[PDB]
Amino acid sequence: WRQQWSGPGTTKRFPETVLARCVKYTEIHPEMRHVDCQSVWDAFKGAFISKHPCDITEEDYQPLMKLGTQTVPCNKILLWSRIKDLAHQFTQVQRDMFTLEDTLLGYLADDLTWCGEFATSKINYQSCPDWRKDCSNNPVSVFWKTVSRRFAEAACDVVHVMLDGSRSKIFDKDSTFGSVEVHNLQPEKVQTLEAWVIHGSRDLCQDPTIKELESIISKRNIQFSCKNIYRPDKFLQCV
Ligand SMILES: Cc1cc(NCc2c(Cl)ccc(Cl)c2Cl)c2cc(F)cc(C(N)=O)c2n1
Ligand SMILES: *[C@H]1O[C@H](COP(=O)(O)O)[C@@H](O)[C@H]1O
Secondary structure, eight states: OOOOOSEEOOOTTHHHHHHHHHHHHHHHSGGGTTOOHHHHHHHHHHHHTTSOTTOOOGGGGHHHHHHTOOOOOGGGBEEESSOHHHHHHHHHHSOSOBOGGGSHHHHHHTTOOOOOOTTSOOOOSSEEOOTTTTOSSOHHHHHHHHHHHHHHHHOOEEEEEEEETTSSOSSOTTSHIIIIIGGGOOTTTEEEEEEEEEOOOOOGGGOHHHHHHHHHHHTTTOEEEEEEESSHHHHHHHO
16 A cells, blocks of 8 residues: 555655755855755755655754755845746846745755655655645645745845736735745845736736735835836846
């Protein structure tokens, strides 16, 4: 008998991949040059192997968190929601700005799936828990929750956030941003959350869910700002 989850399994070559990503990142970001990637992988693995893939906690990821400590300039943070492809394109241009995935820990896991199983050191390449159908506390979900929190707490000055203007929910309170990030911005260091709405011809800052974002933020004594981005590709140049 082998247990079958609703979600897709661990990505093939996942151990080999994460390790290789760590080696590459260290090579190209000179300040990380002396990070031990085998120790980093071992701490990643350590967080989820031999554990039921539904009893994962944030503490499990702390050994890895500590190894992948990176405090980027907090005034240079770019958050995003659902519209990740464009946000990375952006930081591949501006290049002083940072999304989570341009940090080591996020770079290591972006687009990847992993999970283990109780009591053995094996990795499940056949399936992993679905956040909806099976478990909210899986290894992937707990990973992003944990780093999303630390990332957003770090932030300062003006934090900019990208949102998708073709979605029915421009701001989703149940997304990683609406659920974890927004609530961890510190009023001490963050003055403004500036929202960018990307039109994938009318003013989408008026939107109800944007107005709802304005409420969450306003109640943290942080100022809110919203700008339409009519022609997206034109923004990429005019930066
Ligand atoms: C696969 C994945 C999942 C991410 N977060 C899931 C999620 C949602 Cl949608 C809502 C609430 C919570 Cl607490 C959680 Cl954990 C996720 C989040 C990111 F910020 C980034 C990625 C990514 N780059 O792959 C991500 N991926
Ligand atoms: C933290 O979470 C957002 C992306 O998650 P969504 O579920 O909101 O797309 C990203 O900006 C990270 O900084």
